[PDB]
């Protein structure tokens, strides 16, 4: 960098020496002289995520592979942009990267593609779908603010009757799906591609991957109706019997 | 016993570290007592003076408020007169402002106008000694003294600087481009440089804030 | 009678939810290139007069750009060292493929190079050959 | 016609405390961990601290901020001025 | 000269005086009190029990739950009825054509 050698020789700069960059400011016309003289809402706005991006996120180590994929973690990793003002209601998956994304991990997405589900399951990953209320999901993305408000964790909502069939569908692998069909369903997906189905139970971390929260439960770690001692870095659980009845209600 | 400092953050391998002479104010001849390393990405940035020019204009004009007003003919119980209080406040991107500050540090260092010191502590509080020391070390007519935090700044230095118009004592958080240009030479304590480096270095990998920093 | 019970054991979940503030450096991989296709800068780095640093996201600083709605362009940003040497090599590399000396604009102040047309793939591959 | 007398000599000190300390803490946000935004350091009319708008916007914001504390004469004058301003900008 | 001390925001909970007329109403609402608890937790001193709904609030909350939020069994019944209606419509279309 010979430019630095120029700087050392040159004299000390002063305030007056400052000069605007070339073409930074355009000229203007003034009237002093003759120059200027004379003269859809119902449909959920699902937000997609590319598997190639998922491979990019996984390959770059942006999201910990050991931890199961969590939408909140993706928000913490700035993977996708969700705006409550946009009234985003859903999150979905993408079939892109089907041939360049060879990895297995547990994940939960509001919406999943049938083709993508088998491919990740073929690698050995676990995919499920859960329903988050758009208002509740906004709280999920930003848990700290409601702690500042002092609000307690509410019970997770359930889908409207329009979307119940999708979540209840076994092939969709929703939390409302019948677990009894899953062993049969997984074989059918394996048969469709024809790949040898790897049993999840064989995995050493099977329990960690298969862990799922209650439908009422917003958070894997935290049960609904809980409170957090943010000041003391602790978790507070209600001890009132009526509160338990309220949660049951 | 030389005082040897190394950059806490990882310097790029392709960039060699920057170095400068550590000084002390305890004695007149205590010019050199140690050697310190400075991050090239902070103290060896490109000389982009237009950013510094842009920052200076923002600094002067973001506080500008004009209160001039006049009554037009309809408001009489001026064809083009001032119309009420007007403000010129605007915000430059904070990355550019951080970038501009980085450029300023290089200019002072490359121009031999920046003097790195271990601490500001002085044997005496006399303002004369500070002026006397500056003359011996060929410092500029205007010298800026910066400390890590306002609360802990030594009393002796405060008294010397308080009585000197051209020698101004400011905390680390109070540093700005305008003062550096206004003052011929800059005196920085070693802790201040590390504090400045952390914030300036932290500017990298700037996750767009999803919530207020507070 | 307090209505709450406080426990320190279960706070691990809360710690997990905390958001990170710094981009993590790429993890070491047993085999390169990574299955996605990303490969870190080749080691040892080239000893050329000009060094090209990667972007904050550890990606090659090449961006496809179009201006005026008709002029396709590609820009290199993180140019370090002798820009003239890089221009000569870039001109030499692109002259055969384009069929003539490329039309380029050099902004030395910003340390950036402007080239008409879209040639990121060839340049990106060529940069990998250099070891950047 | 022009003055026949000399103006008083004036000398201005550029290193006075006001000029010397001008601009200090302008980097409070970046250097203060962003606890205080630099906009918080703006001193001026309440309705335009950290905010900018055209003449019509400034007057309207002024009315809302201090409308309850404004004089009847001032409020009446402001309404009349606003009406003229509204017609000019929104129709011409 | 020596620069003045840097300006600092006052930390810790601040309790507005309820009697004062000037203090805005929204700063005296329970939501403000709940906000104080979140910022400083125990330092705020807000009773944790107050945070949960009161028994009168509890009764009100259940009313909306039944009124506005049906249970899974109710939807399952609605699906069965709608499926039966759809099946009848399909049969009517087939026989008609």
User: Which residue from C minimizes the CA distance to B48?
Assistant: C109
- Between chains, do D24 and B214 touch, taking CB under 8 Å as contact? no
Residues paired with residue A236 on neighbouring β-strands, in sequence order? A227, C6
Q: Which residues of A touch C6 (CB under 8 A)?
A: 229, 232, 234-236
CA distance A238 to A248: 13
Using CA atoms, how far residue B22 sits from A4, B29, B111, B118, E79, in Å, is 22, 13, 16, 7, 80
Q: Are C70 and C51 in contact (CB under 8 A)?
A: no
The torsion angle over the Cα atoms of residues A131, A137, A140 and A146, rounded to 10 degrees, is: -130
Does A73 sit behind a cis peptide bond, omega within 30 degrees of 0 on the bond before it? no
CA distance B77 to A170: 82
Tokens 């809360």 sit at which residue? Answer: C14
Q: Which residues of B touch C111 (CB under 8 A)?
A: 46
CA distance A35 to A32: 8
Q: Are A86 and A45 in contact (CB under 8 A)?
A: yes
CA distance C87 to B47: 21
Interface check C4 vs E, CB under 8 A: yes
- Between chains, do E1 and B171 touch, taking CB under 8 Å as contact? no
Pair of tokens at residue C129 = 């050959």
Interface check A151 vs C, CB under 8 A: no
User: Which residue from C minimizes the CA distance to E52?
Assistant: C3
Is the sign of the CA dihedral D40, D44, D47, D51 positive or negative? negative
Is the sign of the CA dihedral B180, B186, B189, B190 positive or negative? positive
| Bridge pairing between strands A46-47 and A90-91 | parallel
Question: In which element (H, E) is residue C16 found?
Answer: helix C12-17
CA distance A57 to C23: 12
Pair of tokens at residue E68 = 């506005």
Cβ neighbours of residue E12 closer than 8 Å, sequence gap 6 or more: E40, E43
Cβ neighbours of residue A24 closer than 8 Å, sequence gap 6 or more: B50
Tokens 């004379």 sit at which residue? Answer: A38
Method of elucidation: cryo-EM
Q: Are B122 and A22 in contact (CB under 8 A)?
A: no
**Resolution reached, in Å?**
4.6
The torsion angle over the Cα atoms of residues C109, C114, C119 and C124, rounded to 10 degrees, is: 0
The torsion angle over the Cα atoms of residues D46, D49, D54 and D56, rounded to 10 degrees, is: -10
- Greatest CA span in chain C, whole angstroms? 87
- Between chains, do A149 and E31 touch, taking CB under 8 Å as contact? yes
The string over A84-123, giving b where at least 16 C-beta atoms fall within 10 Å of a residue's C-beta and e elsewhere, is eeeebbbbbbbebbeeebebebbbbbbbbbeebbbbbbbe
CA distance A171 to A188: 9
Rg (CA), chain A: 27
Interface check C99 vs E, CB under 8 A: no
CA distance A55 to A147: 33
Q: Which residues of B touch A18 (CB under 8 A)?
A: 49, 52-53, 56-57, 181
Q: Are B61 and B88 in contact (CB under 8 A)?
A: yes
| Bridge pairing between strands C4-7 and A234-238 | antiparallel
CA distance C85 to C101: 15
Interface check C44 vs E, CB under 8 A: no
User: Which residue from C minimizes the CA distance to E50?
Assistant: C3
């Amino acid at each position: 960098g010979t430019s630095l050698d120029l700087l050392r020789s040159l004299p000390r700069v002063s305030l007056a020496n400052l000069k605007p960059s070339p073409n930074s400011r355009k000229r203007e016309r003034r009237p002093r002289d003759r120059r200027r003289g004379r003269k859809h809402s119902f449909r959920h706005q699902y937000q997609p995520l590319s598997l190639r991006r998922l491979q990019y996120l996984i390959d770059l180590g942006r999201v910990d592979p050991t931890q199961p994929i969590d939408l909140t973690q993706l928000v913490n990793g700035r993977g996708v942009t969700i705006q409550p003002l946009k009234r985003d209601y859903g999150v979905q998956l993408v079939e892109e990267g089907a041939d360049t994304f060879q990895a297995k991990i547990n994940i939960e997405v509001q919406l999943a593609s049938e083709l993508a589900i088998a491919a990740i399951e073929k690698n050995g990953g676990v995919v499920t779908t859960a329903f988050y209320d758009p208002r509740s999901l906004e709280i999920l993305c930003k848990p700290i603010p409601f702690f500042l408000r002092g609000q307690p964790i509410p019970k997770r909502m359930l889908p409207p009757e329009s979307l119940v069939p999708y979540y209840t569908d076994a092939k969709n692998r929703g939390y409302l799906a019948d677990p009894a069909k899953f062993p049969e369903a997984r074989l059918e997906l394996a048969m469709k591609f024809g790949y040898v189905l790897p049993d999840i139970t064989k995995d050493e971390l099977f329990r960690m991957l298969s862990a799922r929260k209650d439908p009422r439960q917003i958070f894997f770690g935290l049960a609904p109706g809980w409170v957090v001692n943010m000041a003391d870095k602790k978790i507070l659980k209600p001890t009132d019997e009526n509160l338990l009845k309220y949660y049951s209600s | 016993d030389p005082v040897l400092r190394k950059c806490e953050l990882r310097i790029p391998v392709h960039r060699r570290p920057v170095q400068a002479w550590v000084e002390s104010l305890r004695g007149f001849e205590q010019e050199r007592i140690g050697l310190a390393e400075l991050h090239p990405d902070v103290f060896a940035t490109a000389p982009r003076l237009d950013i510094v020019h842009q920052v200076a204009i923002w600094q002067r004009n973001f506080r500008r408020i004009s209160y001039a007003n006049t009554k037009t003919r309809a408001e009489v119980s001026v064809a083009h007169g001032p119309r009420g209080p007007t403000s010129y406040y605007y915000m430059l991107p904070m990355k550019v402002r951080a970038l501009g500050l980085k450029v300023a540090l290089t200019v002072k260092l490359m121009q031999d106008d920046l003097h790195i010191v271990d601490s500001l502590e002085l044997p005496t509080a006399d303002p004369q000694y500070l002026t006397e020391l500056a003359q011996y070390r060929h410092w500029g007519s205007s010298v800026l003294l910066v400390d890590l935090t306002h609360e802990e700044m030594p009393k002796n230095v405060v008294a010397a600087t308080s009585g000197l118009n051209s020698f101004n004592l400011i905390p680390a958080v109070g540093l700005n481009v305008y003062s550096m240009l206004k003052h011929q030479t800059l005196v920085l304590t070693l802790p201040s440089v590390a504090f400045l480096e952390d914030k300036l270095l932290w500017q990298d990998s700037r996750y767009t804030p999803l919530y207020p920093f507070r | 009678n307090p209505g709450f019970v406080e426990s320190v054991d279960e706070y691990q979940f809360v710690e997990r939810l905390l958001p990170p503030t710094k981009i993590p450096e790429p993890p070491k991989h047993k085999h390169y290139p990574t299955p996605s296709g990303w490969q870190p800068p080749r080691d040892p780095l080239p000893s050329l007069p000009y060094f090209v640093r990667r972007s904050r996201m550890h990606n090659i600083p090449v961006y496809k750009e179009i201006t005026h709605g008709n002029r396709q362009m590609t820009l290199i940003r993180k140019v370090e060292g002798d820009i003239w040497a890089l221009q000569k090599d870039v001109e030499e590399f692109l002259s055969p493929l384009l069929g003539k000396t490329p039309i380029t604009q050099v902004n030395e102040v910003t340390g950036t190079l402007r080239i008409k047309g879209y040639f990121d793939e060839q340049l990106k591959a060529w940069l990998l050959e250099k070891g950047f | 016609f022009v003055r026949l007398t000399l103006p008083p000599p004036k000398v201005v000190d550029r290193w006075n405390e006001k000029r010397a300390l001008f601009g200090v803490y302008d980097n409070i946000g970046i250097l203060g961990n962003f606890e205080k935004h630099p906009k918080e350091l703006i001193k001026g009319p309440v309705w335009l601290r950290g905010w900018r708008g055209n003449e019509l916007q400034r007057c309207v914001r002024k009315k809302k901020f201090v409308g309850n504390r404004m004089f009847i004469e001032d409020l009446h004058n402001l309404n009349k001025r606003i009406s003229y301003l509204y017609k000019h900008f929104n129709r011409h | 000269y020596r620069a003045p001390p840097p300006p600092r925001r006052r930390p810790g909970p601040h309790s507005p005086d309820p009697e004062n007329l000037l203090t805005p109403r929204w700063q005296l609402t329970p939501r403000y009190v709940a906000k104080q608890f979140g910022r400083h937790g125990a330092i705020s001193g807000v009773p944790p029990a107050s945070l949960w709904p009161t028994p009168e609030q509890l009764r009100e909350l259940e009313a909306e739950e039944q009124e506005w939020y049906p249970s899974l069994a109710t939807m399952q019944e609605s699906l069965r009825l709608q499926q039966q209606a759809l099946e009848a419509r399909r049969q009517a279309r087939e026989q008609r054509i």
